Amino acid sequence: TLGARRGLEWFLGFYFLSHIPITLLMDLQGVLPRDLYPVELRNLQQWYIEEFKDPLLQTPPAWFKSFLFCELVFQLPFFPIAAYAFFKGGCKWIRTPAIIYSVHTMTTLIPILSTLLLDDFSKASHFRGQGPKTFQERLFLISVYIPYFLIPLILLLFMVRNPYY
Amino acid sequence: GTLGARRGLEWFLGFYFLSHIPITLLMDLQGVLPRDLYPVELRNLQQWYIEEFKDPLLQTPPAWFKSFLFCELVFQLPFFPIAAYAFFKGGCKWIRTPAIIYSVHTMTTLIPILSTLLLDDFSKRGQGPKTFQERLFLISVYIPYFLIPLILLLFMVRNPYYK
Ligand SMILES: O=C(CN1CCC(CN2Cc3ccccc3C2=O)CC1)c1ccc(F)cc1
Numbered sequence: 001t002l003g004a005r006r007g008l009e010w011f012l013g014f015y016f017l018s019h020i021p022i023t024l025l026m027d028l029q030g031v032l033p034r035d036l037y038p039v040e041l042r043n044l045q046q047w048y049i050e051e052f053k054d055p056l057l058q059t060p061p062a063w064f065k066s067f068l069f070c071e072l073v074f075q076l077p078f079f080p081i082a083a084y085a086f087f088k089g090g091c092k093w094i095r096t097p098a099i100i101y102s103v104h105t106m107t108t109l110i111p112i113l114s115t116l117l118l119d120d121f122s123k124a125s126h127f128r129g130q131g132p133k134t135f136q137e138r139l140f141l142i143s144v145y146i147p148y149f150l151i152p153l154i155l156l157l158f159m160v161r162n163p164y165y
Numbered sequence: 166g167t168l169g170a171r172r173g174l175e176w177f178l179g180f181y182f183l184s185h186i187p188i189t190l191l192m193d194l195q196g197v198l199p200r201d202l203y204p205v206e207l208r209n210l211q212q213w214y215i216e217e218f219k220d221p222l223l224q225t226p227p228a229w230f231k232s233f234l235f236c237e238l239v240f241q242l243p244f245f246p247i248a249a250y251a252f253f254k255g256g257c258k259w260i261r262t263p264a265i266i267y268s269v270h271t272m273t274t275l276i277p278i279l280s281t282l283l284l285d286d287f288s289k290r291g292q293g294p295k296t297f298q299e300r301l302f303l304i305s306v307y308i309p310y311f312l313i314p315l316i317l318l319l320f321m322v323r324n325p326y327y328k
C-alpha cells in the first residue's frame with residue numbers, strides 16, 4: 001500500500017486544511033463575539049440553522065460550548081500542523097498527536113449525534129420549538145456532523161496500525 | 166519510600182483503575198441501567214447524594230451525559246482491569262497507546278461535565294447548584310476523573326519505559 005497510503009494522506013491533508021475556514025468562519029460564531037464576524041457570515045449561519053434545523057449552533061448549550069472552546073484552543077492550532085505532515089508524508093512525529101486529536105473529536109461527537117437522534121425537541125423540552133421534528137430531518141442534520149466522526153476514526157485506525165508511523 | 170515517584174504513580178494508577186470498577190458498576194451506571202438490577206439501598210444511597218449536593222446530571226440524566234455513561238459501560242469498564250494489571254505489575258509497554266486513548270477520551274467527557282457545573286444555570290429544569298460553594302462541592306466529586314487521566318496522558322506521552 002503506497003498509492004492508497006499516499007492518497008489517504010492527501011485526503012487527510014485537505015480535511016485539516018478545509019477545517020480551518022469551517023472552524024473560524026462558521027463554528028466559532030457560537031463562542032466568539034458576533035462583532036468579530038461580518039454581517040454576511042452571520043446571516044450565512046442563520047441560513048444553515050433554518051435549513052437544517054440545528055438546535056446546537058443556535059442557542060448553544062454549555063456542554064456544546066465547552067467543545068467549541070476545545071476546538072479553538074486545541075483543535076484549531078493542530079489543523080495547520082496536521083495538514084503539513086500529511087501533505088509532506090513520512091512525518092512519524094504526528095502519530096501520537098493525531099491519536100490525541102482523533103479520540104478527542106470522536107468523543108465530542110458521540111453526545112452531539114446522540115442528542116440529534118434521540119433527544120426530544122418538543123414544546124415541553126427546554127429547546128422550546130427549534131430542532132428536527134421528523135426522522136428524515138434528524139438524518140439531514142446528522143449528515144452534517146457525521147464526517148467529523150468518521151474521518152477521525154479512519155485516522156485513528158490508520159495511526160495505531162500503520163508501521164510507517 | 167524506596168518505591169520512588171515513578172513506581173508510586175504506577176501503583177496509584179492501579180488503584181484508580183481498580184476502584185473505578187465498583188464505582189462505575191454500583192453508582193455511575195444507575196443512570197443508564199434499569200432500577201431493578203440495583204438493590205433499593207444502593208438507589209436510596211445515590212438519592213441521598215443527589216439531594217444533598219444538588220447533582221443536576223445524575224437526577225435526570227441528559228442525552229449527552231447518558232451517551233458518556235454508555236461509553237463507560239462498553240469502552241472504559243472492560244479496560245479498567247487490563248490497565249490495573251499493567252500498572253500493578255509494572256513494565257508493560259503495551260499499555261501506552263491504549264491508556265493514551267483512555268486518557269483523552271475520559272478528559273474529553275469530563276470537560277462538558279465540569280463546565281456545566283461551574284457556569285450553567287439551574288434556576289428556571291429540576292434541582293441544581295445555586296451558590297458558588299454548592300458548585301464547588303460538585304466539582305470536587307467530578308474533578309479526579311479529569312486530573313488522574315491527564316496525569317496518565319502526560320505519563321505515557323514521554324516515559325521512555327513505555328515507548
Ligand atoms: O461543530 C462542529 C463542526 N461543524 C462544522 C460545520 C457545520 C455547520 N455548517 C455546515 C454548512 C454548510 C453550508 C453552509 C453553512 C454551513 C454551516 O454552518 C456544523 C458542524 C464540531 C466539530 C468538531 C468538534 F470537536 C466539535 C464541534
Ligand SMILES: O=C(CN1CCC(CN2Cc3ccccc3C2=O)CC1)c1ccc(F)cc1
Nearest residue numbers: 188192193210211214233237271274306307310
Ligand atoms: O460519572 C462519572 C463519575 N462519577 C462517580 C460517582 C459520583 C456519584 N456519587 C458520589 C457519591 C457519594 C456518596 C454516595 C453516593 C454517591 C454517588 O452516586 C459521580 C461521578 C464519570 C467518570 C468518568 C467518566 F469517563 C465519565 C463519568
